[model samples]
Target: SGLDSVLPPSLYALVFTLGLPANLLALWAAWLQVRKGRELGVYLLNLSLSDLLLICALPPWTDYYLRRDVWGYGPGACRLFGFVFYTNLYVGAAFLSCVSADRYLAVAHPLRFPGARPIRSAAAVSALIWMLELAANAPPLLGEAIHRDRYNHTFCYESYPLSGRGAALANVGRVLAGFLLPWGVMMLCYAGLLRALRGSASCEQRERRRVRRLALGLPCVALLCYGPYHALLLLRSLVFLVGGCALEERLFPAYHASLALATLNCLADPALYCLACPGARGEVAKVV
Candidate 1:
């Protein structure tokens, strides 16, 4: 009843419709950066790659919603889709956090910072991010066998047969290592950088503004984009532990809402690029 009442057809359509153009623009922006081969371009390219992968997977979700939550895709599709969706989400968050740290070092310790060497560091970090993401998303491939619902429809997620405490531990690990730790570090780094910038009169107004904008904007976007989803995920885990029924159903819509907001992170990524690379704004403006 709650699912039926909360997820009206129009609302689902409106939400998914808005995501298309934003993700498309983000993808195009990242493509341009790749073509130019700028120093920070590699990170932007990967961020865009993550966003594009997730956005490409959205149609099946929209189809499921349009068909009244009945899944039409097979088990393999589900596992692959879910893997890409979660993998990209975590990878993008981690990459952005890495970019923030890179900026902080570049600004705060420019003399000691490895200048031309950042390109090499970024490549190494990007490779590590991909490897970790693959390892993180591999569980579903191993254990999430496909199952049919009571109505003879198929679903792709790991629902029944609990898969033991190991699976649960993996999920917990994802939230903690993938989300909380990186978020905490980014917040701390930016906070210190902002305080340092504010106390200095030696930096030009424009440079200070640039530093301050990035220091403020990145953590806020990271929190806004990911905070609700992880919060609800943690809540859902807690609810399951408590064996609650009503609260469980209520969370689905909230989870979907948070996911939609997270999708909007791709749209916000160009802003990060602009802040990190001053030339990007000019290029974007010229393209527009």
Candidate 2:
């Protein structure tokens, strides 16, 4: 109760204050790149939009924590809130993977896929990912996530004993598809990008340095942001399917802490994907 009342609201407040401007700046950078007809711009644009969506979902949750996990908005709002939150998580993951794969393919195997339209294909893929993620995370909208406790305080999506068999199934699927699969692709893409750059005798020193920084840091940021939260999701699913009250009790506070930790990506994404890039810096330099 002590940490719960203090940590989550503070983290959410910090994220909202810093993250909103970061995503806005990232979106502006992406817009400039898109104007220049860059393919990776499409992916970055979608990723920033997804991060902004996640940022918009934070206020209700911040209120929830400030009230010590009370869901004052009622079940309907909580369902939509839960839906938006989950959808943005996977959408962000898919787009980050898309950006990594885009750079990797361009660098490592430029001649492998000779497409006549690069930006068009990226746009098509980004649209497809949005649809897929929305559909995948829609199940929460059909169910109840808010429950009235003995104190008459309504808690939303607390998981633990509230998780049903259906939710457990969804958790497994989410872990496998949303986090693990995309994370694996990013790992491979980053490794490939690094190796390809190292072997290229004609690569510009600046480009090589950029690639190394991005390839090394992006994966670490993804892991630091989402790893603990998803790990707890899997653990909660395990408790739901196999039965473990002891483990669930231990998971409660850690689960809440990890959820706050997951939002760190909102701040990190813009820094890594936009501000760190030379192109984005050039755009900012003109404005400043």
Candidate 3:
């Protein structure tokens, strides 16, 4: 009933209407940089590609959520949508990580770091990131299901529900492997980069400052955007497993609102592109 009242029309319109155009503009900007073979352009290109794919699929979901929640699109669409969503999400994270790592390597090990000359290596790395993303996100594509509720006329997500100890193990794996590990690595790498920058000269200092700003800003924005949603989702699942209520009825709206904010990451990503690629900003100013 709440789904019918809250999601089907108003929320769907709000999300998709904004998300679609925002992601498309990001895609176009990234494509222009890629065409020019700008340094680190390939990573930006792939990030935009990931965002575009995810946003493009949202219209059908908008319709489904707005309607009686009937999943008329069937199993294939569910699997595909899940795969696309997760892949884009994971790829987006990976690219941000890549950007940090690349900058770190460049700053900390200039001579050893391949000089940032060959755009081809960046292209190769971008390809590798996508391939890894595809592999990583294939789990949901293989078994996660979309359930249509006949009673409430809504759709629900059900992952590969493992039983007993298996479920516990799965949850642990998801938390550690998906969130904690990557987050830890990103923090460590950026921390070292910041430390190195602090010790450098004026020109190097300025460059490092710009890079650090992008490095810190993107991940912070991502955490602000998606962190709470996933955190709440994780908490909800944990509470469900323990047979306890994780949130009050009033908080359910807050939970859903956090999820909506997380979904807005696709729209907000264009800002990250501008931050990461200042040259792109200059190019845009020239064109404008």
Candidate 4:
């Protein structure tokens, strides 16, 4: 419990402080790019919006952790935070997929996806991503309470069986939808982009550098933030699967820390945007 509370609340506190202004500036800059008719601007806009969702979810959670695990907020509030919090992670992950694909197609197979540059198409794609994220993330919140009544502290992000098959399965939700699906797409995108860059003699050193920087920074950010969290999620899932109560018991203590580290991604997203989006870089840096 000490380990859970000690770092999580502090991490969340910093997230709240940094994430708000950072994401707001990102949105403003991204919106400006979209207004300027920058082809990739729309994807950045959607990514900012998704990151904002994750940022918005932080306040309640920060308060919850700071309050020593008890949520003074009612069940309704608990459920809201619980649902919005994890939901946004997957949403952001999905938007990152959009970003990666947008970049890949524009660079790697420009002729094949020639119309990918149209502003209207980007707008349409943005709209579709938003709808899909909403639809995909809605179910967990729609059916039942996100909070557990038995706990002294209000439980958020706790699922069925509380610690067994149901809990393991719940953690896997993001694994399937967020990491595997989105990251898989991103990998293909990166591979194609890499090949294209290597093949193109016309590409300037500066141009290649920028793209390489973006390509490197984007995945690094995602993996560093989400990797440990998901790894622990899988560990917990297996512990539950084999009914390894001792392992589960030992591992439960570190779960909150993993979750806290995952919140770091909310902060990391906008920062990575500054690195990855050239149009966004200068303006967002000004904002940051």
Candidate 5:
């Protein structure tokens, strides 16, 4: 229980403090890019919005953890918070994939896909991601996400039996669709972009360096932040499949730590997408 109360709350406190301002600045810069007619801003805008939503939801969870997993908030509030938090996780991945795909297409296959009107396509993709995330998270929102144990301790979204058919199936879906699918798309985008860059001699050395740095940074941070979390998710699912209570009991602390680590994606978004971009960085620089 010390692991639960101490580590997650500490990391979340830092995440909220840093992630909130970073994402707000990101949104401001993203708005400027949209005004300049850059389609990439559309993805950045949606990504920052998702991060901000998650950042706002962090405080209640920090409280929840600091209180040793008890949900002081009522059931409705619990569901609302859980919905927003979980929605951000998948939404974050979806928009990051959009950003990766957008970049890859811009560099590698500039003339392909959806013709010259990229703004419309990017906007449409952003809208679709939101729709899917909301629909996919409906199960937890509609279910009993809040629970009370025999010890009278309350939990939000931690009450499910992983071995149960519905939840286990859902975990498999989440590992496959939620993390792996997006992660693979980003990696493919990176590989294509790298290959394309290698063939283009028209790029200056300076430009090439920046592109290579970003290509490495983007997916590396995604993996570092989200990789372990989903790995643990998959591990839990496997343990559940075998109905192994012993392994499941040992996984509890690691699972909580990894879930907390996943929130670091919010902190990385502004650094990777907005500040790293010339346009957004300039806008943010002038404002400061």
Candidate 6:
């Protein structure tokens, strides 16, 4: 109940409406821009594609939440919903980090990054990210992330394996690879870019400050969106390590609530694209 149900379904509904068209528009724009041999194309296209991927999960989960978790989609869809949701969360993060690095290369050291800005390299990076995210998230599906509830509706990852050695053991892969690693990369990418901007003598102070603020945006997004959910998950796993609550209570409302909160990033990602990429804005502007 509480914020768990109230916050997530509402946010999901909002994101579904807003994000679907935003991502589709962004996707089309990115495609056209990329077709013109734009360097940012590969990354921006993949980022929009990732947003589209996330919305696929949102529609089903939104339906699940709106109907009070009845899971009319059936158990297999239930499993897929959970898997794709979190998997895209990480994939989205990975691509955003890639975007940050790309921006850093172009902004920070333009002369040195020749050919580093090529579409071919960016496309290769995007493909590798997709493969890695797919591989890392594959295991959770085989586990008990989905199971039929006692009431006949299927329950997804939100309420699974609350306390156990196996659960704790399972979390290491996701914690390290899915979350912390990508977050760390984002921090580093943004940090490197900021440092470079600060050192620029030609740029005005106000301009540097504005760009610094822009560069810091994604890191803040990482913190605000991902921080709470991962914190609660970290605490849960640590407890399991020492040996573990009214686990159901914490899981249903607490962890689930935090996980739902993280969905906002799918919407946030495109806004960053608009802010950071001139091509993206130009393409969107033409559409408008």
User: 1-288 in candidate 1: lDDT tens per residue?
Assistant: 234334544443543465445445555666567565444667777776777687677667666655655666776677777778778889888878776676677667768875665567788889998998898788767754566657444546645323455655666677788887878878877877787566666988888787777788778888898888888776665444444355755666677667767766766775556534556555554445
Q: For residues 32-122, could you state the per-residue lDDT of candidate 4 as single tens digits?
A: 7777767666776677776677678777777776676666677677667766777677767777877788778878777776464578877
Which regions of candidate 2 fall more than 4 Å away from where they truly are?
112-115, 204-210, 285-288
Worst-scoring 10-residue span by lDDT in model 2: 151-160
Which sequence of candidate numbers ranks them by TM-score, best first?
5, 2, 6, 4, 1, 3
Candidate 5: pairs in clash: none
Prediction RMSDs, each to the true structure: 3.4, 2.1, 3.8, 2.8, 1.8, 2.6
Q: Residue-wise lDDT of candidate 2 within 51-93, one digit each (tens)?
A: 9999999889888888877887877888888888778878888
Off by over 4 Å in 3: 1-15, 18-22, 35-39, 148-150, 154-172, 203-215, 240-255, 275-277, 285-288
Summarize candidate 3's per-residue lDDT along 144-253 as a digit string, tens digits: 36654435544534422233554445545555565646555666677778787676557565576676776676667877876876676566556546632335344465
Residue 146 in candidate 3 has what lDDT?
64
Model 5 local distance difference test score: 0.84
Better of 3 and 5 by TM-score: 5
lDDT, candidates in the order shown: 0.68, 0.83, 0.63, 0.71, 0.84, 0.73
TM-score of 5: 0.94
Q: Where does candidate 4 stray beyond 4 Å?
A: 112-117, 143-151, 159-167, 204-210, 284-288
Cα displacement (angstroms), candidate 1, residue 254, comes to: 1.8
- lDDT by residue for model 5 (1-288), tens: 558779999999999889898998999988888887688888889999999999899889899888888887787898888889989988999888888888888887776753677788789889988999899989877777777777656777875355266787788788899887998899889878977988776988898887887787788899899989889887777666764446655777788899899988998999877777776787787564
The residue-by-residue lDDT of candidate 6 on 221-262, one tens digit each, is: 767887788777777776667622356455657676777778
Lowest-sum lDDT 10-residue window in model 3: 154-163
Clashing pairs in 4: none
- Weakest 10 consecutive residues of candidate 1 by summed lDDT: 1-10
| Deviation (Å) of 74 in candidate 5 | 0.4
What is the TM-score of each predicted model, taking all chains together? Answer: 0.83, 0.92, 0.78, 0.86, 0.94, 0.88
State how far residue 199 of model 4 sits from its true place (Å).
2.3
Clashing pairs in model 6, backbone N/Cα/C closer than 3 A: none
